[PDB]
Amino acid sequence: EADCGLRPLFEKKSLEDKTERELLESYIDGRIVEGSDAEIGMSPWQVMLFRKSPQELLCGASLISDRWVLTAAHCLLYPPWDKNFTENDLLVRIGKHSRTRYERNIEKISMLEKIYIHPRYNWRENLDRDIALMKLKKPVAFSDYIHPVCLPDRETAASLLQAGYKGRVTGWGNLKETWTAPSVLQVVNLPIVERPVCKDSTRIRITDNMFCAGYKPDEGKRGDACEGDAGGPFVMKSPFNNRWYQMGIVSWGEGCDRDGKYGFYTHVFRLKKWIQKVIDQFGE
Ligand SMILES: C[C@@H]1CNc2c(cccc2S(=O)(=O)N[C@@H](CCCNC(=N)N)C(=O)N2CC[C@@H](C)C[C@@H]2C(=O)O)C1
Numbered sequence: 001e002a003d004c005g006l007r008p009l010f011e012k013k014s015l016e017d018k019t020e021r022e023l024l025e026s027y028i029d030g031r032i033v034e035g036s037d038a039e040i041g042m043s044p045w046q047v048m049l050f051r052k053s054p055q056e057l058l059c060g061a062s063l064i065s066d067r068w069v070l071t072a073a074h075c076l077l078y079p080p081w082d083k084n085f086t087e088n089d090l091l092v093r094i095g096k097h098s099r100t101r102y103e104r105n106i107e108k109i110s111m112l113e114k115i116y117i118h119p120r121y122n123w124r125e126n127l128d129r130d131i132a133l134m135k136l137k138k139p140v141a142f143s144d145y146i147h148p149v150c151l152p153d154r155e156t157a158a159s160l161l162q163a164g165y166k167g168r169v170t171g172w173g174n175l176k177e178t179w180t181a182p183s184v185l186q187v188v189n190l191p192i193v194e195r196p197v198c199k200d201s202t203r204i205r206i207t208d209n210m211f212c213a214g215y216k217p218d219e220g221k222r223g224d225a226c227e228g229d230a231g232g233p234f235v236m237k238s239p240f241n242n243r244w245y246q247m248g249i250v251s252w253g254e255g256c257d258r259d260g261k262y263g264f265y266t267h268v269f270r271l272k273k274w275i276q277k278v279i280d281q282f283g284e
Contacts, residue, residue: 001065005150005243008143009041017042023189024239026166034223035188040097042187043170045149045246048093049075049134049231051085058085059231060171061134062246063094063148066141067283069134070275072231072249072266073121076132080123087112092134095145097185099172106145111137116278118271129209130251130266133275135283149235150245151276157269160236160247163194167213167236167247169263171228179226179256186227190214193262201260209270211248214262225263226256234265 006012017039022029047061047069059075069092076085088111095107113135122128140146152160168189173182190213198212213234215221234248248265255261268275 001148001150003142004064004148005238005241005245006147007041007044007244008145008147009044011242011244019187019189020237023166023168023237026164026191028191028219028221032220032222034190034221035186035227038097038170038185038187041145043185043233043235044095044145044147045233045235046094046096046170046185047071048096048172050091050093052089052091057172057174057229058090060174060229060233060250061092061231062233063140063146064151064246064275065148065279065283066139067136068279069136070233070246070249071132071134072127072130072251073117073123073132074127074130074252075231076115077117077121078123087115090134092136094140095143099183099185106143108140108146110140113137114282116282118274126205126207126210127252128207129271131249131271131274133278149233150243151272152245152247152269153272154269156238156240156245157247159240160238160245161192161211161269163192165236166191167234169225169228169232169234169250171232173227174229175226175250176224176256178230188223188225188227190223190225190263198262198264201262202254202264204254206264209267210251210264211267212262212264213248217259224257225250225253
């Protein structure tokens with residue numbers, strides 16, 4: 001996308017969201033709290049993936065063009081639970097801040113033309129390459145509240161996706177609500193963890209198409225990956241062109257809020273080839 005990574009209400013407008021300068025600095029602070037209410041238009045690529053019959057929220061996602069939504073394959077397909085949603089079992093709302101409040105002339109809704117899951121998406125073991133692209137029927141117009149997010153390049157992925165560096169999840173606590181055995185848009189900034197540690201922390205076979213984020217718990221923080229939503233986006237603001245890049249789809253995890261457990265994600269850049277191939281050779 002020629003226009004992405006720049007929020008209409010922020011970067012385009014010289015203003016900067018309260019908690020962002022702790023992302024560029026990747027500098028951790030003296031606070032127990034981590035996530036709270038997210039401000040108006042703080043993430044204009046956030047997409048609400050819905051089930052049709054009955055009506056319910058499934059996953060979060062991301063607008064990348066006026067045509068393509070990006071998400072975790074699991075949201076659409078999981079045969080251990082015979083979960084196979086077709087194009088017309090699902091819909092999307094964009095520009096939503098309040099979970100239960102229609103903002104007039106502001107929020108949009110759309111049905112899907114087609115669904116594209118990854119071919120060697122290993123849903124049989126560890127949800128390898130948990131990625132999926134959704135094409136829209138009627139295309140959406142970018143306003144102040146709807147804007148596409150950027151995709152990483154080789155320089156950005158090498159320079160940003162390292163341990164200690166920080167990223168950000170946004171959602172509506174779907175996850176938290178689903179596995180607690182909540183209202184307006186949530187934002188919680190998490191740091192990237194060492195792949196040596198990611199492995200170490202889980203009994204489950206991980207791949208390079210996967211990375212983890214969270215806090216090692218000898219530095220007691222209340223920063224949990226469950227305040228967002230499944231299939232949601234992981235984003236990191238680049239200090240080389242101000243642009244916000246999506247780095248990892250919220251993939252999977254063990255339990256939720258606990259010491260020395262981290263949210264694993266799809267390695268977006270590592271699959272940059274696939275995503276782009278379908279936009280270049282299928283839509284428009
Ligand atoms: C290979 C994975 C391993 N784990 C699981 C699987 C399936 C069902 C439930 C689990 S869970 O209990 O460990 N945890 C849930 C919820 C925890 C969310 N953690 C995060 N920090 N993201 C989960 O990972 N998943 C991912 C797979 C889907 C199918 C169910 C469920 C979810 O709703 O996100 C398959």
